[PDB]
């Protein structure tokens, strides 16, 4: 609890801030080391992509009852998820410090790869996107650059694993990230709206031309952007309004 | 038993409750020497 | 997820029983602790190593029936709880069980109560020839049975060794020694060692034993080294030999049947006397001396060795001469001495302990105990006090205050220092003699309440009546109110 | 470097390091900086550095595995060293780490050395250098006691724990340590248990948590008299407690039963306490003088003798008791200084200095108390008011010194300003009467001084005002006649104004009328004993009281005449109208329907309606109009009654009025319903929509509500329609509900059957229900179970119950498979867009059901939150919205689609208990403890949809049982299986039947012993709540 | 403090009545009702019961305490069991030397606290024999037992198992469970017997409570 405040606060000496980041990263690595993937990753992964190409992985798991995996302490699970999200938020914020930047970057790329692998494994039968939205929401330029590079690495790793853009987007967390951005475009806080808008901007500009998918989702995108235009009161800064207007007037011309 | 048992008592306080009874008791106990 | 019927069927399938002689997760966890804290006890199998405390059911019945709880529970003035009713039902069960026991005993149908049986004086005195023959009986018969079992075990072990040799190869064979050939001239002129104590196999004989019921390895069928790692040697040498024919020529003596010792005839299954197979069980126990408290043992660091009290002055009050003496009873003096010896001279804690009153107590002026009062009383009672001996902050202020108090006591006959009085001469402010003034207050309270009662009574005794002519219904009044409202 | 040296010098074992910390270190710097950090470093020195730390395309895989290998091998240094370096900045980390670590280090201590460790810890706690650590909030002692409490088996002395908790802001840790040993001890431990209870009672008294204090005495005490007196005192009545203590002391001193000093000290002290609360100051004066006490100042000067006179004894007493000063003594000394300043003996600067010192003392006392506001802070708040108003009084005295000769009007403006400021600053009614009397008497002193200086009238009219207010407050406490009599006698102030004297005489006459003497004498003395003098309202009130007294007896005509006289005295006075109406209603109830006094009763009720707390009159009006009138005379009286009706106070009685609309009182209730429609539309709109030639009138008021306020009607109907259409249950929810109903029916049939339930067959109704469930439900495990049950024409009850339980479990798993969280926009676009398109303001539904009196400050809806949460409930899954308010406070709401057929009865019971709560939260004795009935707020949107306030964290006891079974691993239906099997096996046909109650009791005892332990909730809330506070 | 005198006089009355009972009964008869340990019972210790509140009550829960190996004792042995005297032939060994004989530990059948006596590690005798000394043994814990066209009788594995199970079922090193319980003699199951006995006891306890 004091570690979060000390990492955020610049008044304490940089030594204590570095120690607090080390503590936070140690706790996060401890959490990450629990959900271990199967050791034989290569052959099992190949079989898994063959199965998902067969497109029958999901219905096979449920029994006569839909839920077959027991769970315990659902409230404790929710608290653990919240703590994990907050720790990853602190990890993103730690990139601003010059002494932390390199190890924070290495850890964040590693956890990005681990999260994409874990999502693939689960789909064979999350919470990274919330921290991603926070990082895109931050005012500090370095945090925004870290978030943008992180989402770029998400797409790069996805296209590397699946091997092509057309095959990846079908069974990737790209659709889930799209839905998360669209939903957070509807959120009440201003900074969440900014994060959602900038994420949609990069997804519609820097991504490798998946025009058919965005043409399918154009109606939802238009409605979300009009909502973010409506909700922002004029008294607040107009960066989100300008970004939304630019995105609308470019995207609507683009795929139509 | 320690919690639920109360020592017994006798109803000899009917006369002592009256103010004159208290005067008599006070006089007797003060002059007990 | 088992179905409901599966659960109701399972509870009717009895339960696997755990024998009394079986590790039940309540043990010493083996000799994990030090050897010096463990003691080996060798008890005969008849007697029990562990016994549970109990008191005779007659005693329990009498103690419960001297004052039953079922009389108290209806008369309760405090909140009840399930536990009280649990205890009441349990004592009721005690009472009914004892009543049924007594009813069975009265009808002379109680197996535990039997007439004493006659004993022949002649038999118990001297041993006849037949009884010695029967001692030799038991001994050779146990010997023959154990010999047969041991011979079977040894022979099957030898056969298994031959089979192992014929499979893994001459590896298990002996390493061999050089052959000492002698010349023709030589013929021209011409465990496994030491008091061996071979054990014997458990009793399964032949048919079951080729399955080799073994812990993890072949058993020890010959132990001639006799050391027993030097730990079990005393166990071996000091165990009584069992089924002995002659009791080392100690008088004559005679071993009788175990059913002959018991005056009871063992007419019930519960009344079976011990088998007396003459076996010793081995159990390890925690040494009682280990459980005893012992002095702390540790190693000092850089410092802390002989780090080592002093009575610092508590903060004295401002210099004044209008105080009132605080009288200390002998019990208070004893408590102060015991606390000061024990409470490490922390005057705040002593003053808190002596002035602990549990019910909204107004402290009398005489009886109040502030830390300065405790310090003054301790200085007075010590009588070995020295002014310059004292060390600590507040030293000079307290020294000046004490000097001023002594000077005032010398000049003015009034007493400032606390003084002690015995229990005979209880003074005005003490708790022992509150009752006089309190009863005065009680009497005045009764007087006030009687004044309120009697004065109210006569005034209450009055009466009068009035005519109800020209009573007006409320409806006329509502109309009048509306007319007034219209006017305004 | 220093820590490395001090650590590697010591032994690696944790127990030896703990012994070194507790026993060897002297902590030379007197704990100015919390040494727990150094102790924590020394303890952590024993930790290993080998990383046991755990809880509880080919190229890409190679890179990820390399990263994972980097993640692993995380040594304890990478966690501990950052913790060591960060604990320096903040003390909360030190406290938390010590609480976490201490029990584990203690566990390493073998039982052989336990006594030495306890003695060393006691010696460490007893050292005096901690006295400079009082101010730090995460101080050393709090952490030490918390760690001691966490580790079982360690028992500190009781009074030491009491002192440490009291003086170092460690109250709740001390309470935990005292309560752990107070109960669950052997008979040989009676002495230590008694000492622990004594310490706990000290702490409870200190915190002013007097309820648990009285409870602990009533549990511990032995004599019956002590128990009865303590209970009567706790309830609030004091005279009977005084009498019981009197009897107890007399019995003890007469030797009738054994005399024990313990609880005899309690009898003495509590008798003094009840005597001072009952305002027996004059009696206590001689007791204080004879015995010597600290309340001699409290009663002799503060309420008896004047401070300006006989100053020397009071000064000597204050100087004598000034040792170990506490606030109240400082108020006494400051009051002495101020009263001296009145005589110009003392300067104002001296008074200011004394007030500053007292303020510092009270701040220190406040800082001693815990952070959360408890009942103890009430006295300190009263003391704060005392100091502030004392400074105001000092300024008043300074202004008053310059009387300006006859120019009194120059300073009279400032005097009136200060007095009017004082008159609006009073303690609440539910405050203890001691505070009220303290404040009243102090202001009596101030007003007396102002009177003395002031020797077109300038006088002490505030004297009588504060006395009258104190008398009213004493009446609200139901205190006996002594206090009110003393107040009334003091009201007739000597040398008072003629008008004030007449008012005091009238008040005394009214009090005598309340007594039996004037009532027995009659109306000549009850209401005509010179009470009527330029005060028509007082005469009317006295006449009403006399009429009520007459109506208490069988004097009906006399009561009617008295009520008529009271009404004629002042027609505007409402209380006389209400009393007359109640008397008329009593006459109507007693006499049969042959006399229609309801004609007058309803009229006087209607004209008394103009007045808060008028809901009783409206309820009686509705009841009266509900009963028989063949000619409808009461209807005409209601219609002909020209008195205005309070439209706002009919809001609460909207459902009963709507129900009565169908009956013969339609022509009566239609007008009031129309009036309540136009003025307050939203409160009626929801109920009127839900209730939809009876229905023609409903359409008429609906049209009226549409004509006026059209935007409100449009917005509300749009919101309701969207909520109804967009929110619906899936077929899985219906199947789960059907399975739950079938399982409940089967369980009831099996358990409630008088037969031993030895596979008893079920009737054809069960087979028909199983077939219907199989046909209706979608193919799944539940459908298969239903089909299997329908296959057997007459299956055993056990088999059907098992099949239904399996089906319900499968349906529950299927329902819980879906994620609870969701978004509002996808499920319903309009709700998320509502706040943009809303035309006018809307208050949150259900606000009008409360008992407020004005509509001005209602919370208005701002925006629906986009996060819609799905929650599984007992009846089934329900959707939870989250409506934000205008003020920014969330108002979670649950939507129930199935609802129930009996929701109207639930709403009516809710209204009744809300009325009881409103009446209950005003009485002094009930409000002093903050008692509330905490009913939910439920408003019916449509005949099939209702919404009730369902805040998060509501976990039913069934949920607690589910969590316990899930953690332990047992099946939920385990006790039911146990009970059914034991009951079936008990009834063996070989021999006759046993007693059903006895076998049920034994089965319950077995279940408690084996399946469900008694300490279930305690363990759950012990693991749920870590900090003992 | 008069309650102390009341309690001590109650104890005095109880012990005096016990003395008069034993003197009136022991003359010509042997009475074992008063002796608490003489009909010695080696109760089982099931771990199913966890709460452990009022162990005598909860007749079903107490029924898990099946009695095993009932035994009778010589009155002198029972007297030694009372007080803290050691057993006659106890041999206590410490540091390869004899010490003073130790009394049996005292354990609470209810309380689950740690006790200072473990399970019997091994059973052994020391018997001289014609070859020389021997140390016989049995297993302290019983084995699980049975660890191992029309078919011909020789090939029938089940029949051979039946032979090897019946032949080794009456002279085992450790006897079978064979508990001494009244269930078999009542022709009804142990569950029903326990439930109905608890029922009868509880009904009579309630009628006794309602008597006063």
- Provide DSSP, E137-159: EE-SS---S----PPPTTT-HHH
Alpha-carbon distance C241 to C223, whole Å?
A: 18
DSSP 3-state of E24: helix
Residue C69 with chain B: CB contacts under 8 Å? 1
Nearest to C322 among D273, D319, D641 (CB): D319
Experimental method reported for this structure: cryo-EM
**Pairing between strand E133-134 and E127-128?**
antiparallel
- Tokens 């279940």 map to which residue? D1007
Q: What subunits make at least 3 CB pairs under 8 angstroms with C?
A: B, D, E
Put simply, the chain D residues between 996 and 1025 with a CB less than 8 A from any chain E CB are 998-999, 1001-1003, 1005-1006, 1008-1010, 1013-1015
DSSP 3-state of D880: strand
| Whether D420 contacts D368, CB under 8 Å | no
Strands (E), chain E: 29-31, 42-43, 67-68, 91-94, 97-98, 105-107, 122-124, 127-128, 133-134, 137-138
Phi, psi of D203 (to 5 degrees): -65, -45
DSSP 3-state of C388: coil
Nearest alpha-carbon partner for A21 in A97, A134, A126: A97
Nearest to C207 among E39, E57, E167 (CB): E167
Alpha-carbon distance D364 to B15, whole Å?
A: 52
DSSP annotation of D860 reads B
- For CA atoms E74, E77, E78, E79, give the dihedral sign: positive
Number of Cβ within 10 Å of residue C322's Cβ equals: 11
Helix and strand numbers, DSSP H then E, in chain C: 15, 4
- Which residues, 6+ apart, have CB-to-CB distance to C109 below 8 Å? none
Angle between helix E190-211 and helix C82-106 axes, rounded to 10 deg: 100
| Whether E48 contacts C16, CB under 8 Å | no
Concatenating the DSSP letter of every residue in B10-27 gives: -STTTTTTSHHHHHHHHH
Number of Cβ within 10 Å of residue C327's Cβ equals: 19
- For CA atoms C370, C372, C373, C379, give the dihedral sign: positive
Alpha-carbon distance C394 to D164, whole Å?
A: 23
Strands (E), E5-75: 29-31, 42-43, 67-68
- Tokens 């540091």 map to which residue? E95
**Residue D477 has which token pair?**
């406490």
Alpha-carbon distance D705 to D710, whole Å?
A: 8
**Residue D689 has which token pair?**
């929509």
Which site among A38, A64, A85, A108 would you substitute to test the D interface, given the most D Cβ atoms closer than 10 Å to its Cβ? A64
Concatenating the DSSP letter of every residue in D647-684 gives: SGGGSTTHHHHHHHHTSTTHHHHHHHHHHHHHHSHHHH
| Whether E199 contacts E88, CB under 8 Å | no
Which DSSP helix (H) or strand (E) runs through C285?
Answer: strand C280-286
C-alpha angle E44-E48-E51 in degrees, rounded to nearest 5: 110
Concatenating the DSSP letter of every residue in D33-79 gives: S-THHHHHHHHHTT--SS-------HHHHHHHHHHHHHHS---THHH
Q: Where are the alpha helices (DSSP H) in C46-183?
A: 57-65, 69-72, 82-106, 129-168
Q: Give 3-state DSSP helix, strand, coil % of chain C, rounded to 5.
A: 45, 5, 50
Alpha-carbon distance C5 to D136, whole Å?
A: 62
Nearest alpha-carbon partner for D746 in D730, D736, D761: D761
Alpha-carbon distance C296 to D23, whole Å?
A: 10
Structure resolution in Å? 3.4
D998 touches chain C (CB under 8 A): no
| Whether D609 contacts D617, CB under 8 Å | yes
**Pairing between strand E105-107 and C50-52?**
parallel
- Which residues, 6+ apart, have CB-to-CB distance to C381 below 8 Å? C333, C336, C337, C420
| Shortest Cα–Cα distance, D938 to chain C (Å) | 36
- Which residues, 6+ apart, have CB-to-CB distance to A125 below 8 Å? A57, A58, A61
Which site among E4, E11, E46, E51 would you substitute to test the D interface, given the most D Cβ atoms closer than 10 Å to its Cβ? E51
D250 and B7 in contact by Cβ < 8 A?
A: no
Nearest alpha-carbon partner for D20 in D54, D1, D46, D50: D46
Alpha-carbon distance C9 to C32, whole Å?
A: 42
Alpha-carbon distance D218 to D240, whole Å?
A: 17
- Which residues, 6+ apart, have CB-to-CB distance to C479 below 8 Å? none
Q: What subunits make at least 3 CB pairs under 8 angstroms with D?
A: A, B, C, E
Which DSSP helix (H) or strand (E) runs through C39?
Answer: strand C38-44
| Whether C282 contacts E123, CB under 8 Å | yes
Distances A141 to A93, A96, A135, A147, D704 between C-alpha atoms, Å? 11, 9, 10, 10, 60
Nearest alpha-carbon partner for D869 in D859, D879, D861, D860: D879
- The number of angstroms, rounded, from the C-alpha of D542 to the middle of its chain's C-alpha atoms is 38
**Pairing between strand E137-138 and E122-124?**
antiparallel
Alpha-carbon distance E110 to D765, whole Å?
A: 50
Residue D911: beta bridge partners? none
A114 and D836 in contact by Cβ < 8 A?
A: no
Which DSSP helix (H) or strand (E) runs through C25?
Answer: none
Strands (E), D664-803: none
Number of Cβ within 10 Å of residue D569's Cβ equals: 20
Query: If 0-12 CB within 10 Å is exposed, 13-18 middle and 19+ buried, where does residue D332 land?
Result: buried
Alpha-carbon distance A15 to D345, whole Å?
A: 63
Alpha-carbon distance D315 to D338, whole Å?
A: 13
**Pairing between strand E91-94 and E122-124?**
unpaired
| Whether D687 contacts D658, CB under 8 Å | yes
- Which residues, 6+ apart, have CB-to-CB distance to D618 below 8 Å? D609, D649, D650, D653
Alpha-carbon distance C370 to D167, whole Å?
A: 15
Nearest alpha-carbon partner for E92 in E77, E106, E105, E80: E105
Which DSSP helix (H) or strand (E) runs through D485?
Answer: helix D481-491
C-alpha angle D495-D496-D499 in degrees, rounded to nearest 5: 140
Distances D719 to D824, D855, D903, D914 between C-alpha atoms, Å? 14, 22, 22, 27
C-alpha angle A42-A48-A50 in degrees, rounded to nearest 5: 105
Number of Cβ within 10 Å of residue B24's Cβ equals: 13
- The number of angstroms, rounded, from the C-alpha of D16 to the middle of its chain's C-alpha atoms is 49
Residue C266 with chain E: CB contacts under 8 Å? 72
Phi, psi of C212 (to 5 degrees): 60, 65
Residue C440 with chain B: CB contacts under 8 Å? 26
**Residue C306 has which token pair?**
């002989």
Which DSSP helix (H) or strand (E) runs through C41?
Answer: strand C38-44
**Residue D1008 has which token pair?**
């408690």
Residue D994 with chain E: CB contacts under 8 Å? 195-196, 199-200
Which DSSP helix (H) or strand (E) runs through D823?
Answer: strand D821-823
Alpha-carbon distance D166 to D144, whole Å?
A: 14
DSSP annotation of E124 reads E
Number of Cβ within 10 Å of residue E207's Cβ equals: 11
| Shortest Cα–Cα distance, D256 to chain B (Å) | 6
- For CA atoms D713, D714, D717, D720, give the dihedral sign: negative
DSSP 3-state of A60: helix
Which DSSP helix (H) or strand (E) runs through C283?
Answer: strand C280-286
DSSP 3-state of D275: helix
**Residue D221 has which token pair?**
């005490």
**Residue C10 has which token pair?**
């399972």
| Shortest Cα–Cα distance, D83 to chain A (Å) | 7
| Shortest Cα–Cα distance, D553 to chain C (Å) | 13
Distances B12 to A114, B9, C247, D248, D257 between C-alpha atoms, Å? 88, 9, 80, 12, 11
């Amino acid at each position: 609890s004091a570690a979060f405040s000390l990492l955020t606060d610049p008044r304490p000496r940089i030594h204590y801030r570095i120690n607090s980041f080390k503590y936070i990263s140690g706790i996060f690595q401890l959490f990450l080391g629990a959900t271990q993937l199967p050791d034989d990753y290569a052959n099992r992964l190949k079989e898994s992509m063959d199965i998902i190409l067969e497109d029958t992985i999901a219905p096979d798991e449920p029994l006569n009852k839909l839920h077959h995996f027991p769970v315990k302490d659902i409230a404790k699970y929710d608290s653990q998820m919240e703590l994990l999200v907050k720790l990853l938020e602190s990890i993103f914020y730690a990139v601003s410090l010059q002494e932390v930047r390199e190890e924070s970057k290495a850890l964040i790329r590693g956890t990005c790869n681990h999260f994409i692998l874990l999502y693939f494994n689960k789909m064979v039968i999350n919470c990274i996107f919330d921290a991603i939205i926070y990082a895109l929401s931050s005012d500090n330029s370095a945090v925004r650059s870290m978030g943008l590079e992180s989402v770029q690495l998400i797409y790069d790793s996805c296209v590397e694993l699946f091997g092509n853009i057309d095959c990846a987007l079908k069974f990737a967390p790209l659709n889930v990230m799209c839905s998360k951005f669209i939903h957070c475009c509807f959120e009440e806080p201003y900074h969440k709206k900014l994060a959602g808008c900038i994420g949609l901007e990069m997804m519609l500009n820097s991504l490798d031309i998946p025009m058919k998918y965005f043409n399918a989702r154009q109606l939802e995108i238009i409605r979300a952007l009009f909502y973010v235009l409506r909700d922002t009161a004029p008294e607040l800064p107009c960066e989100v309004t300008n970004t939304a207007k630019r995105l609308i007037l470019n995207s609507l011309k683009e795929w139509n | 038993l320690r919690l639920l048992d109360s020592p017994q008592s006798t109803g000899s306080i009917s006369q002592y409750l009256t103010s004159q009874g208290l005067t008599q008791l006070y006089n007797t106990l003060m002059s007990a020497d | 997820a088992p179905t409901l019927s599966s659960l109701i069927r399972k509870y009717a399938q009895d339960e696997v029983p755990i024998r009394p002689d079986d590790p039940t997760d309540r043990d010493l966890n083996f000799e994990l602790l030090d050897r010096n804290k463990t003691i080996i006890q060798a008890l005969p199998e008849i007697y029990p190593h562990k016994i549970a405390d109990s008191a005779s059911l007659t005693e329990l019945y009498y103690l419960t029936q001297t004052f039953p709880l079922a009389k108290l529970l209806p008369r309760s003035h405090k909140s009840l709880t399930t536990d009280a009713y649990e205890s009441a039902l349990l004592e009721g069960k005690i009472a009914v069980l004892y009543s049924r026991i007594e009813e069975l005993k009265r009808q002379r149908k109680w197996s535990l109560r039997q007439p004493k049986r006659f004993i022949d004086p002649f038999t118990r005195e001297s041993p006849t020839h037949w009884d010695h023959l029967l001692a030799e009986m038991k001994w050779l018969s146990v010997d023959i049975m154990e010999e047969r079992k041991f011979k079977a075990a040894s022979c099957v072990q030898l056969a298994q060794a031959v089979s192992d040799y014929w499979t893994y190869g001459k590896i298990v064979c002996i390493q061999r020694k050089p052959l000492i050939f002698l010349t023709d001239e030589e013929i021209k002129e011409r465990n496994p060692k030491d008091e061996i104590i071979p054990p014997a196999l458990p009793t399964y004989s032949m048919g079951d034993y080729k399955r080799l019921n073994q812990n993890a390895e072949p058993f020890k069928l010959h132990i001639g080294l006799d050391d027993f790692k030097k730990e079990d040697l005393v166990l071996v040498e000091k165990l009584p030999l069992s089924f002995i024919f002659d009791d080392n020529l100690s008088d004559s003596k005679k071993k009788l049947s175990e059913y002959e010792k018991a005056p009871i005839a063992a007419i019930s299954t519960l009344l079976a006397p011990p088998e007396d197979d003459e076996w010793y069980k081995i159990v390890i126990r925690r040494d009682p001396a280990s459980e005893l408290s012992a002095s702390l043992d540790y190693q000092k660091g850089l410092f802390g060795a002989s780090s080592q009290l002093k009575p610092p002055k508590p903060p004295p009050i401002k210099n004044l001469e209008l105080r009132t003496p605080t009288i200390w009873l002998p019990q208070d003096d004893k408590l102060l001495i015991r606390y000061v010896a024990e409470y490490a001279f922390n005057w705040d804690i002593i003053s808190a302990h002596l002035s602990a009153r549990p019910a909204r107590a107004y402290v009398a002026n005489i009886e109040r105990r502030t830390p300065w009062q405790c310090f003054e009383r301790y200085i007075q009672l010590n009588d070995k006090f020295q002014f310059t001996d004292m060390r600590g902050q507040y030293a000079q202020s307290a020294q000046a205050w004490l000097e001023a108090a002594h000077k005032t006591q010398s000049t003015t006959k009034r007493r400032i220092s606390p003084l002690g009085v015995g229990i005979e001469s209880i003074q005005r402010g003490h708790r022992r003699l509150r009752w006089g003034s309190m009863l005065d207050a009680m009497r005045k309270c009764m007087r006030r309440r009687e004044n309120i009662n009697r004065s109210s009574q006569v005034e209450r005794k009055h009466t009068s009546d009035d005519k109800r002519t020209n009573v007006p219904t409320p409806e006329e009044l509502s109309r009048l109110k509306y007319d007034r409202d219209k006017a305004i | 470097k220093l820590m490395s040296i001090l650590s590697d010098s010591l032994e690696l074992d944790i127990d030896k390091r703990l012994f070194y910390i507790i026993k060897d270190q002297n902590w030379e710097y007197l704990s100015d900086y919390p040494w727990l950090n150094q102790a924590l470093q020394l303890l952590y020195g024993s930790f290993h550095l080998d990383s046991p730390i755990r809880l509880s395309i080919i190229d890409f895989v190679a890179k990820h595995n390399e990263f994972l290998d980097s993640v692993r091998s995380l040594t304890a240094g990478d966690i501990l060293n950052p913790l060591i370096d960060i604990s320096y900045q903040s003390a909360e980390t030190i406290h938390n780490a010590w609480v976490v670590v201490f029990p584990v280090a203690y566990s390493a201590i073998e039982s052989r050395y336990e006594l030495e460790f306890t003695r060393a810890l006691v010696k460490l706690l007893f050292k005096d250098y901690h006295i400079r650590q009082q101010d730090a909030r995460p101080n050393v002692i709090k952490s030490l006691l918390d760690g001691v409490g966490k580790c079982p088996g360690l028992h500190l002395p009781p009074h030491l724990v009491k002192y440490l908790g009291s003086n170092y802001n460690a109250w709740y840790g001390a309470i935990k340590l005292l309560e752990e040993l107070s109960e669950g001890q052997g008979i040989d431990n009676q002495k230590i248990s008694d000492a622990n209870q004594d310490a706990l009672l000290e702490v409870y008294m200190s915190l002013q948590e007097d309820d648990m204090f009285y409870g602990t005495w009533r549990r511990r005490a032995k004599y019956f008299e002590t128990n009865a007196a303590l209970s009567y005192e706790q309830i609030g009545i004091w005279d009977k407690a005084l009498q019981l203590y009197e009897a107890a002391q007399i019995k003890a001193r007469s030797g009738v039963f054994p005399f024990g000093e313990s609880e005899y000290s309690l009898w003495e002290d509590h008798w003094i306490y009840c005597a001072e609360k009952l305002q027996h100051w004059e009696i206590l004066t001689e007791l204080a003088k004879h015995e010597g006490f600290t309340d001699l100042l409290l009663e002799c000067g503060w309420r008896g003798a004047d401070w300006i006179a006989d100053r020397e004894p009071l000064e000597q007493s204050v100087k004598t008791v000034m040792d170990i000063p506490t606030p109240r003594r400082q108020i006494f000394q400051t009051f002495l200084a101020l009263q001296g300043f009145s005589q110009q003996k003392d300067t104002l600067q001296d008074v200011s200095r004394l007030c500053d010192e007292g303020i510092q003392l009270t701040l220190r006392k406040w800082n001693a108390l815990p952070q959360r506001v408890t009942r103890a802070h009430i006295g300190l708040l009263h003391t704060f008011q005392q100091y502030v108003e004392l400074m105001e009084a000092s300024q008043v005295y300074s202004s008053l010194v310059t009387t300006n000769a006859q120019n009194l009007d120059v300073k009279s403006q400032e005097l009136k300003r200060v007095l009017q400021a004082w008159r609006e600053r009073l303690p609440n009614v539910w405050d203890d009467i001691n505070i009220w009397n303290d404040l009243v008497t102090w202001r009596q002193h101030v007003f007396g001084v102002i009177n003395r200086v002031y020797m077109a009238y300038r006088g002490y009219h505030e004297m009588a005002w504060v006395i009258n207010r104190f008398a009213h407050v004493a009446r609200k406490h139901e205190m006996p006649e002594v206090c009110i009599n003393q107040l009334t006698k003091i009201y007739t102030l000597p040398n008072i104004e003629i008008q004030e004297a007449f008012l005091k005489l009238r008040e005394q006459a009214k009090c005598h009328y309340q007594n039996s003497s004037e009532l027995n004498t009659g109306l000549d003395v009850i209401s005509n004993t010179n009470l009527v003098y330029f005060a028509t309202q007082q005469k009317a009130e006295f006449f009403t009281l006399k009429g009520m007294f007459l109506a208490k007896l069988n004097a009906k005509d006399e009561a009617n005449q008295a009520f008529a006289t009271a009404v004629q005295i002042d027609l505007n006075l409402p209380k006389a109208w209400a009393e007359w109406g109640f008397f008329n209603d009593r006459r109507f109830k007693e006499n049969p329907e042959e006399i229609f006094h309801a004609k007058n009763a309803i009229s006087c009720y209607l004209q008394a309606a103009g007045l808060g707390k008028t809901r009783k009159l409206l309820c009686r009006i509705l009841w009266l109009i509900s009963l028989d009138d063949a000619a409808g005379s009461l209807a005409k009286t209601f219609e002909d009654h020209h008195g205005e009706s309070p439209v706002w106070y009919w809001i609460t009685f909207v459902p009963q009025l709507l129900t009565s609309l169908s009956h013969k009182e339609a022509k009566i209730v239609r007008h009031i319903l129309i009036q309540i429609a136009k003025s307050y539309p939203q409160s009626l709109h929801f109920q009127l929509r839900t209730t939809k030639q009876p229905w023609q009138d409903v359409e008429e008021i609906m049209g009226i509500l549409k004509t006026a306020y059209p935007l409100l009607a449009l917005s509300l109907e749009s919101l309701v329609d969207q909520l109804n259409q967009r929110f619906k249950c899936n077929a899985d929810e219906d199947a789960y509900r059907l399975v739950i109903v079938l399982y409940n029916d089967g369980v009831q049939q099996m358990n409630r059957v008088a037969n031993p339930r030895e596979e008893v067959k079920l009737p054809a109704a069960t087979e028909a229900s199983i077939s219907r469930f199989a046909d209706s439900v979608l193919p799944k495990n539940i459908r298969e179970v239903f089909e299997q049950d329908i296959i057997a024409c007459n299956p055993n009850l056990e088999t059907y119950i098992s099949k239904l339980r399996k089906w319900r479990d499968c349906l529950e798993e299927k329902l819980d498979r879906s994620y609870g969280k969701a978004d509002l926009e996808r499920v319903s676009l309009h709700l998320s867009l509502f706040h943009h398109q809303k035309f006018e303001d809307i208050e949150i539904p259900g606000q009008y059901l409360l008992h407020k009196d004005n509509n001005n400050h209602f919370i208005k809806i701002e925006r629906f939150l986009p996060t819609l949460d799905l929650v599984r409930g007992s009846n089934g899954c329900y959707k939870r919205m989250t409506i934000r308010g205008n003020d920014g406070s969330l108002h979670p709401f649950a939507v129930q689609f199935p609802a129930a057929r009996h929701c109207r009865r639930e709403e009516r019971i809710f209204q009744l208990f809300r009325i009881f709560d409103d009446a209950l939260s005003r009485k002094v004795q009930s409000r002093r403890r903050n008692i509330s009935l905490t009913l939910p707020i439920a408003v019916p949107l449509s005949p099939h949809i209702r919404i009730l306030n369902d805040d998060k964290r509501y976990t039913t006891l069934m949920g607690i049982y589910e969590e316990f079974c899930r953690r332990k691993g047992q099946s939920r239906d385990e006790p039911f299986a146990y009970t059914i099997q034991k009951l079936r096996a008990a009834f063996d046909p070989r021999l006759p039947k046993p007693d059903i109650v006895s076998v049920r009791a034994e089965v319950l005892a077995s279940i408690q012993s084996t399946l469900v332990p008694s300490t279930l909730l305690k363990d759950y809330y012990t693991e749920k709540f870590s900090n003992y506070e | 403090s008069t309650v102390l005198n009341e309690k001590d006089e109650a104890i005095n009355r109880a012990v005096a009545e016990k003395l008069r009972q034993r003197k009136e009964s022991d003359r010509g008869w042997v009475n074992l009702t008063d002796d608490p340990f003489n009909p010695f019972l080696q109760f089982t210790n099931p771990d199913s019961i966890l709460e452990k509140g009022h162990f005598p009550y909860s007749s079903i829960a107490a029924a898990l305490f099946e009695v095993d190996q009932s035994n009778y004792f010589d009155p002198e042995i029972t007297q030694l069991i009372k007080d803290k005297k050691p057993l006659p032939r106890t041999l206590c060994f410490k540091d390869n030397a004899l010490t003073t004989p130790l009394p049996p530990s005292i354990y609470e059948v209810a309380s689950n606290n740690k006790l200072d006596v473990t399970a019997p590690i091994c059973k052994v005798r020391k018997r001289m024999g014609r070859r020389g000394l021997w140390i016989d043994r049995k297993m302290t814990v019983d084995e699980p037992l049975d660890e191992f066209q029309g078919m011909n009788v020789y090939d029938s594995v089940d029949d051979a198992n039946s032979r090897l199970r019946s032949r080794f079922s009456f002279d085992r090193d450790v006897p079978l469970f064979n508990p001494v319980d009244p269930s078999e003699l009542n022709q009804i199951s142990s569950q029903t017997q326990s439930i109905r006995f608890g029922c009868m006891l509880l009904t009579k306890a309630y009628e006794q409570v309602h008597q006063a």
